[PDB]
Amino acid sequence: GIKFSAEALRCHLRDHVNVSMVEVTDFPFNTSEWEGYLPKESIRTKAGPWGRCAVVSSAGSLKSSQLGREIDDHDAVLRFNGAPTANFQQDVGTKTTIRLMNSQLVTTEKRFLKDSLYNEGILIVWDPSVYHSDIPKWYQNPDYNFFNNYKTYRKLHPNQPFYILKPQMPWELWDILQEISPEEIQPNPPSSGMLGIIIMMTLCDQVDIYEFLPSKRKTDVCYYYQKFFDSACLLYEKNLVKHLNQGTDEDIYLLGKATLPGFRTIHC
Ligand SMILES: CC(=O)N[C@H]1[C@H]([C@H](O)[C@H](O)CO)O[C@](OP(=O)(O)OC[C@H]2O[C@@H](n3ccc(N)nc3=O)[C@H](O)[C@@H]2O)(C(=O)O)C[C@@H]1O
Numbered sequence: 521g522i523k524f525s526a527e528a529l530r531c532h533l534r535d536h537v538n539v540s541m542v543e544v545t546d547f548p549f550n551t552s553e554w555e556g557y558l559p560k561e562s563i564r565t566k567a568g569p570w571g572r573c574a575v576v577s578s579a580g581s582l583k584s585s586q587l588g589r590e591i592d593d594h595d596a597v598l599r600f601n602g603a604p605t606a607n608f609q610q611d612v613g614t615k616t617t618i619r620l621m622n623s624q625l626v627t628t629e630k631r632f633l634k635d636s637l638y639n640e641g642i643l644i645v646w647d648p649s650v651y652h653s654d655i656p657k658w659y660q661n662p663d664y665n666f667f668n669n670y671k672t673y674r675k676l677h678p679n680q681p682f683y684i685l686k687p688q689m690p691w692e693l694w695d696i697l698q699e700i701s702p703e704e705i706q707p708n709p710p711s712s713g714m715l716g717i718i719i720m721m722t723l724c725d726q727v728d729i730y731e732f733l734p735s736k737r738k739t740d741v742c743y744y745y746q747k748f749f750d751s752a753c754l755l756y757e758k759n760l761v762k763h764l765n766q767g768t769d770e771d772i773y774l775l776g777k778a779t780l781p782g783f784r785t786i787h788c
Contacts, residue, residue, distance in 0.1 A: 580741025649687035735776030
């Protein structure tokens, strides 16, 4: 089992994980090649602070969940990668406030530069670095070289806020996942879902998380918008979220809903 309490784990996350974006003052994003590309205003001036927020997993158990009104009844909603609301609004809601994407999508998915779903809300892209790398070292060897398509999207959509997560943040979170499950952890970075939860805990007083912990609807379907199975179709991440959950067991089983307090509200 996990050795620390929920209250202590929340404080450890607040203190060890630096939720911040690459800034125009971080070398080499202050080079002439990068001038004008990054947002100059912090995400904290575009995003909140908010009272009640939703994080919507991309899990297949959202299909037929009819969670759309529950999700939309929030100040802000975060979604992941290419997860759509169109044709699914009754299950997953209509609002998209923040969309967190991995660098694989930005680098290799041609629809990133074509599909209008990406044009709504605030965008964040993240890329897994080598563990313990700083920004200059990471820049020389990203997991996916997403920088060109980032720049292209910025030019096509200059007034949509589009941030890059600092590379240190996923591994800081990994450190805490290892503390709580050292014998089971894999040397892969946390999932986008886990990152998005921590991001919303930084911007919100209360974070409701839908179908990250499995509900009655647990299914073989990997993602709610999947049309069939292919090569496209975590345990310690779920245990962390369960450990921090303030909601009822009934909310998990029926609504697939966990509720986590935001960092602004905890006492350390
Ligand atoms: C084939 C593949 O690469 N799948 C990965 C996809 C894929 O790269 C993107 O959709 C871009 O195409 O990205 C991930 O997955 P993705 O961002 O799509 O999914 C969002 C988050 O929902 C949670 N989830 C999803 C499915 C499921 N059955 N259970 C879940 O709990 C996870 O927390 C997940 O992160 C990712 O970024 O994390 C991780 C996935 O492994």
